[PDB]
Enzyme design. Structure first.
Site, PDB file in Angstrom:
ATOM      1  N   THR A  37      28.151   7.260  31.977  1.00 10.26           N
ATOM      2  CA  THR A  37      29.554   7.449  31.561  1.00 10.26           C
ATOM      3  C   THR A  37      29.842   6.622  30.297  1.00 10.26           C
ATOM      4  O   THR A  37      29.508   5.430  30.219  1.00 10.26           O
ATOM      5  CB  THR A  37      30.520   7.000  32.713  1.00 10.26           C
ATOM      6  N   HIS A 191      25.691  13.405  42.378  1.00  4.51           N
ATOM      7  CA  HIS A 191      25.923  11.970  42.447  1.00  4.51           C
ATOM      8  C   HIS A 191      26.346  11.575  43.859  1.00  4.51           C
ATOM      9  O   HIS A 191      27.509  11.812  44.227  1.00  4.51           O
ATOM     10  CB  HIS A 191      27.024  11.561  41.439  1.00  4.51           C
ATOM     11  N   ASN A 194      26.514   4.822  44.123  1.00  2.00           N
ATOM     12  CA  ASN A 194      27.398   3.905  43.443  1.00  2.00           C
ATOM     13  C   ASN A 194      28.823   3.839  43.934  1.00  2.00           C
ATOM     14  O   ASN A 194      29.754   3.566  43.161  1.00  2.00           O
ATOM     15  CB  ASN A 194      27.428   4.188  41.911  1.00  2.00           C
ATOM     16  N   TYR A 196      30.985   6.162  45.040  1.00  2.00           N
ATOM     17  CA  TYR A 196      31.971   7.212  44.783  1.00  2.00           C
ATOM     18  C   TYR A 196      32.100   8.087  46.022  1.00  2.00           C
ATOM     19  O   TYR A 196      31.527   7.728  47.059  1.00  2.00           O
ATOM     20  CB  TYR A 196      31.541   8.017  43.528  1.00  2.00           C
ATOM     21  N   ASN A 251      31.662  -0.860  43.894  1.00  2.00           N
ATOM     22  CA  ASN A 251      32.762  -0.079  44.460  1.00  2.00           C
ATOM     23  C   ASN A 251      32.882  -0.211  45.956  1.00  2.00           C
ATOM     24  O   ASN A 251      33.297   0.695  46.667  1.00  2.00           O
ATOM     25  CB  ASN A 251      32.617   1.399  44.132  1.00  2.00           C
TER      26      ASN A 251
HETATM   27  C1  LIG Z   1      27.842   2.015  30.725  1.00  2.00           C
HETATM   28  C2  LIG Z   1      27.250   2.530  32.005  1.00  2.00           C
HETATM   29  C3  LIG Z   1      27.711   3.741  32.578  1.00  2.00           C
HETATM   30  C4  LIG Z   1      27.088   4.242  33.749  1.00  2.00           C
HETATM   31  N1  LIG Z   1      27.476   5.452  34.204  1.00  2.00           N
HETATM   32  C5  LIG Z   1      26.869   6.019  35.281  1.00  2.00           C
HETATM   33  C6  LIG Z   1      27.118   7.418  35.649  1.00  2.00           C
HETATM   34  O1  LIG Z   1      27.854   8.222  35.060  1.00  2.00           O
HETATM   35  N2  LIG Z   1      26.374   7.919  36.714  1.00  2.00           N
HETATM   36  C7  LIG Z   1      25.529   7.113  37.466  1.00  2.00           C
HETATM   37  O2  LIG Z   1      25.083   7.567  38.504  1.00  2.00           O
HETATM   38  N3  LIG Z   1      25.238   5.882  37.081  1.00  2.00           N
HETATM   39  C8  LIG Z   1      25.840   5.312  35.992  1.00  2.00           C
HETATM   40  N4  LIG Z   1      25.426   4.087  35.500  1.00  2.00           N
HETATM   41  C9  LIG Z   1      24.197   3.456  36.056  1.00  2.00           C
HETATM   42  C10 LIG Z   1      22.887   3.748  35.294  1.00  2.00           C
HETATM   43  O3  LIG Z   1      22.531   5.130  35.425  1.00  2.00           O
HETATM   44  C11 LIG Z   1      21.742   2.888  35.786  1.00  2.00           C
HETATM   45  O4  LIG Z   1      21.423   3.233  37.145  1.00  2.00           O
HETATM   46  C12 LIG Z   1      22.101   1.400  35.711  1.00  2.00           C
HETATM   47  O5  LIG Z   1      22.599   1.139  34.424  1.00  2.00           O
HETATM   48  C13 LIG Z   1      20.881   0.498  35.957  1.00  2.00           C
HETATM   49  O6  LIG Z   1      19.828   0.773  34.914  1.00  2.00           O
HETATM   50  P1  LIG Z   1      19.632  -0.156  33.699  1.00  2.00           P
HETATM   51  O7  LIG Z   1      19.283  -1.462  34.181  1.00  2.00           O
HETATM   52  O8  LIG Z   1      18.372   0.537  33.011  1.00  2.00           O
HETATM   53  O9  LIG Z   1      20.723  -0.007  32.763  1.00  2.00           O
HETATM   54  C14 LIG Z   1      26.044   3.521  34.396  1.00  2.00           C
HETATM   55  C15 LIG Z   1      25.657   2.279  33.855  1.00  2.00           C
HETATM   56  C16 LIG Z   1      26.239   1.771  32.676  1.00  2.00           C
HETATM   57  C17 LIG Z   1      25.792   0.420  32.164  1.00  2.00           C
END
Ligand SMILES: Cc1cc2nc3c(=O)[nH]c(=O)nc-3n(C[C@H](O)[C@H](O)[C@H](O)COP(=O)(O)O)c2cc1C
Ligand SMILES: Cc1cc2nc3c(=O)[nH]c(=O)nc-3n(C[C@H](O)[C@H](O)[C@H](O)COP(=O)(O)O)c2cc1C
EC number: 1.6.99.1
Lengths: 399, 399
Positions: A37, A191, A194, A196, A251
């Site tokens: 997102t 999804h 997280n 939701y 959440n």
């Molecule tokens: C800015 C941001 C937005 C995110 N939006 C979503 C999303 O739309 N859907 C989702 O399932 N996870 C979302 N996540 C989680 C990421 O998909 C990922 O699982 C999480 O960042 C951990 O990976 P990383 O350590 O490589 O960043 C988001 C994370 C960040 C930082």
């Protein structure tokens, strides 16, 4: 600047650069862009950003054969509640999503739409403005202090869904998945992670229902598996993925503190393999690692060490994508991809590095991300992070 | 003779020789004798063998601080059905068990009684001779061909227990546990593995009940956790262990073919940690490894590789004993005991090696076992396997 004290390691000699087929797509490597997102969609209408979204996605689809999972998209107005996240219910949204899918496909990469429903994480006041309910599994447990301050200011109290309103959300899931495939997406990701709405039904803390949708492992899993089944009947199992976060606490989910949490997720994984045997194997299972229990905590913070996601591999026998603090840990990735059906999702570093796949292959330094523009209505911190070449021209030491 | 082509490895430098407290017992090392039926008990009366049993157990309790889990003992006549396995319901049995507990304790080792109930694995004809029912969870699924030939020759058809008859088995479990502790045992192990009655209720293939005891993960686990709770109220949680075999297929259990099997066992492990938090942590969980799905198959046969028992460590946080083809694999043990709360059960090689613990510590050769006397009404193949010293005097090459 580049990440200061990181020692990169080239990964071109690992299975991360071996091809794999995922659904109908023949990926040329195994680094995927997980759903992120970014809040650049336009209000009113939750329209994908007309000025910048095609560019953003085109930039990250530059290495051929990359699987891209989109930012979460709302299946309908009632599934939403953030004005600047995109939806996938109207013609007006789909006209902009078609342009994004075309651009990714012209770069010979793939695009999977993540279908999103907020539940109690939505802003009750945005929804009340629009005449919509503030939904969740139950009505006697709330997400946190400021979500309940919001709901009563708004006089839009949390509502336990009835079976009919759950049925309606399944109707909307199917239509949104039909809309994404008709507009040109290669597949959709449900999804169910997280914190939701589907995760609020899976979790014992948020789900205190006594009907057919709460009260046991089977009942708490019911709404997620009815969604899987409905989408599999609608668009085919090879076009459907499922994302789960067994240990996440974002959440207000339980995480590893709930002693029954591995059994709740082992059950979902077993039902999926059950269908796999009956011919309908989903495209993949996507897991968020205990390495990241909250994605808004800096890498290394909120790491849960008393549990592992490896139990899923004893049950589900298909492709699994794993995401959570893997970019700064090539030594962990190296071990993890020795498994021949594991893909790695890189979140925060795909925001700052449009060319992350080449930098991983070659062991090149990584651009720092700017947390302040993760959610901003700007091109800055969205489409202007430099490729390695551009960063050298800019002098991000080395000029 | 010694095992011909085995390369021993001394394990005296590993955690297998570090002390650990298990319940009230301070073990001096972590190699335990797992429960081994040997069929030397006397008929009528299922009396522990008067001539040889004290010697057998005294021989294997020779290394101080060894935890010994007895052969399974029937809690009552209706729990039985093999004439030469021992029981723990009558005065006459307990007079012989007291002598065994005293001898083990004079050697400064410990003894835990395994409480056994056969279900469908019992011989229907022995039970019919004695006026007893042929019990199981259900009545429309049988164990195998010759068990149903037996039941109809005997005209003693398989019976689904009623809730009242389950309650009676819980009554008997408590009394048998009281009898063992009163006669001097350090604790009891609830046998809920290897396809016997509690495992027939846990397993989806053997349990097709529609009441409160079948039909979901929670209901299939009900009878095992009511036993845990009853014994914990009766004799204390620090005197109760539970044995489980998630992947076993012996006596017609499902094993890894059932996609829901990890969730069924993850639930039991989570309920146990739940009680642990509420203060009542069981002494240990004892797991049979997927390395051995059937104990009557030679080491290396019937190995299930598509699943692992490691999920239990994400849920249960107390001591776990692991058993299954570990004697011929010191390199696997070496890795497994790096975990600080893991104990290793050695079955078939503790039959042939009274002094197994010294041979493990020192890396000495291992005596072959004679499969033909595992179940024999004889001293031969029971009390006459030589210690290493005796084997050298006998010339088992080296004289
Ligand atoms: C800015 C941001 C937005 C995110 N939006 C979503 C999303 O739309 N859907 C989702 O399932 N996870 C979302 N996540 C989680 C990421 O998909 C990922 O699982 C999480 O960042 C951990 O990976 P990383 O350590 O490589 O960043 C988001 C994370 C960040 C930082
Ligand atoms: C002769 C024999 C009798 C056994 N009797 C029992 C028993 O009474 N209780 C039990 O739970 N397991 C029983 N087992 C299983 C063992 O405890 C152990 O789990 C199995 O032998 C695998 O370990 P191993 O490879 O070290 O022998 C028996 C195994 C054998 C070979």
């Amino acid at each position: 600047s580049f990440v200061k004290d990181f020692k990169p390691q080239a990964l071109g000699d690992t299975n991360l650069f071996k091809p794999i087929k995922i659904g109908n797509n023949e990926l040329l490597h195994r680094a995927v862009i997980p759903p992120l997102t970014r809040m650049r969609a336009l209000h009113p209408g939750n329209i994908p950003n007309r000025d910048w979204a095609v560019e953003y996605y085109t930039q990250r689809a530059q290495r051929p054969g990359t699987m891209i999972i989109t930012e979460g998209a709302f299946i309908s107005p009632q599934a939403g509640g953030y004005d600047n996240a995109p939806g996938v219910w109207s013609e007006e949204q789909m006209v902009e999503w078609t342009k994004i899918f075309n651009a990714i496909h012209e770069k010979k990469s793939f695009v999977w739409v993540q279908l999103w429903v907020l539940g109690w994480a939505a802003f009750p006041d945005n929804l009340a403005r629009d005449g919509l309910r503030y939904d969740s599994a139950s009505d006697n447990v709330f997400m946190d202090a400021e979500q309940e301050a919001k709901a009563k200011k708004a006089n839009n109290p949390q509502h336990s869904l009835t079976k009919d309103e759950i049925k309606q959300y399944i109707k909307e899931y199917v239509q949104a998945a039909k809309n994404s495939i008709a507009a040109g997406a290669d597949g959709v990701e449900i999804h169910s992670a997280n914190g939701y709405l589907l995760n609020q039904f899976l979790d014992p803390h948020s789900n205190t229902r006594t009907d057919e949708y709460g009260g046991s492992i089977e009942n708490r899993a019911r709404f997620t598996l009815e969604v899987v089944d409905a989408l599999v009947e609608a668009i085919g199992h090879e076009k459907v993925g499922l994302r789960l976060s067994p240990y996440g606490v974002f959440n207000s989910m339980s995480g590893g503190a709930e002693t029954g949490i591995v059994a709740q997720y082992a059950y979902v994984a077993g039902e999926l393999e059950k269908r796999a045997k009956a011919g309908k194997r989903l495209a993949f299972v996507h897991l968020v690692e205990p390495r990241v229990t909250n994605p808004f905590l800096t890498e290394g913070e909120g790491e849960y060490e008393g549990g592992s996601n490896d139990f899923v591999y004893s049950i589900w026998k298909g492709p699994v994508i794993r995401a959570g603090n893997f970019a700064l840990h090539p030594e962990v990735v190296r071990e993890e991809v020795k498994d021949k059906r594991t893909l790695i999702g890189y979140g925060r570093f795909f925001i700052s590095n449009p060319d992350l796949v080449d930098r991983l292959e070659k062991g090149l330094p990584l651009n720092k991300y700017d947390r302040d523009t993760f959610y901003q209505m700007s091109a800055h911190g969205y489409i202007d992070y430099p490729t390695y070449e551009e960063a050298l021209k800019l002098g991000w030491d080395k000029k």
